[PDB]
Design a protein around this ligand. Structure first.
Ligand SMILES: C[S@@+](CC[C@H](N)C(=O)[O-])C[C@H]1O[C@@H](n2cnc3c(N)ncnc32)[C@H](O)[C@@H]1O
Ligand SMILES: O=c1ccn(-c2cccc(-c3ccccc3)c2)cc1O
Ligand SMILES: [Mg+2]
Length: 218
């Protein structure tokens, strides 16, 4: 049932629970995007950049996906709705209140079986993925957490043997606000082949973009 509606996050979940079709992931995405366009801005990847994320998944067909930063579960629902039977999205969220919302959002959208939500800091969890979460390597990683953590987490994923030839990294917000150290690293390194996707900041007319970086191997 409903939450108190004290926080933006509770009000976003409440709006979905009251105003979206249960079990319909598309209806859920639309309800979040409408509310956030109309009522309260929120840091979801949103519909325009969401379309780019969709395209990346459609092209590369990942089965093992990792997301860094879940928030209210918008991108988790967005990516999971596209996955084939037996695909797995692991999503990491440091804030326990946000994680609780994300699980409710995932369940409501009908994609619970595809999602493994992990409460904790990416730098603590990423070392554990192989041994604790039965990961071999990752097919795709969506980076959309604190932007100063894009670089250290990418290096950590590599250090932990989670990246293979062909692993797709996709990073939100490489323009607004930017993650220049990450961007310099992936573009400058022969270990990554990069593609830039210019777009717009969620719910705004501000220019933004994502970067796709395909790992070439060490
Ligand atoms: C931009 S929001 C996530 C938006 C979500 N990807 C979407 O599009 O719907 C960023 C989130 O990352 C979480 N976060 C920041 N740093 C993190 C870290 N090191 N590990 C795990 N989560 C982190 C924050 O608590 C916040 O909820
Ligand atoms: O994941 C994200 C974290 C922060 N911002 C973010 C960072 C800095 C500014 C703004 C912003 C700018 C103008 C209007 C509204 C928000 C938004 C955007 C994201 O997609
Ligand atoms: Mg973002």
């Amino acid at each position: 049932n409903l939450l108190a509606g004290d926080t933006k996050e509770q009000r976003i979940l409440n709006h979905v629970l009251q105003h979206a079709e249960p079990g319909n992931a598309q209806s859920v995405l639309e309800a979040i995007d409408t509310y956030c366009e109309q009522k309260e801005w929120a840091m979801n990847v949103g519909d325009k950049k969401g379309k780019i994320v969709d395209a990346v998944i459609q092209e590369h067909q990942p089965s093992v996906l990792l997301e860094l930063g879940a928030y209210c579960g918008y991108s988790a629902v967005r990516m999971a709705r596209l996955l084939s039977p037996g695909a797995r999205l692991i999503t990491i969220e440091i804030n326990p209140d946000c994680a609780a919302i994300t699980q409710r959002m995932v369940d409501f959208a009908g994609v619970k079986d595809k999602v493994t939500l992990v409460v904790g800091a990416s730098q603590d969890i990423i070392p554990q993925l192989k041994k604790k979460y039965d990961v071999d390597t990752l097919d795709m990683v969506f980076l959309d957490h604190w932007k100063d953590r894009y670089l250290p987490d990418t290096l950590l994923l590599e250090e932990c043997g989670l990246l293979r030839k062909g692993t797709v990294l996709l990073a939100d917000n490489v323009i607004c606000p930017g993650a220049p150290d990450f961007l310099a690293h992936v573009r400058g390194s022969s270990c990554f082949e990069c593609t830039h996707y210019q777009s717009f900041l969620e719910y705004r007319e501000v220019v933004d973009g994502l970067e796709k970086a395909i790992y070439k191997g060490p």
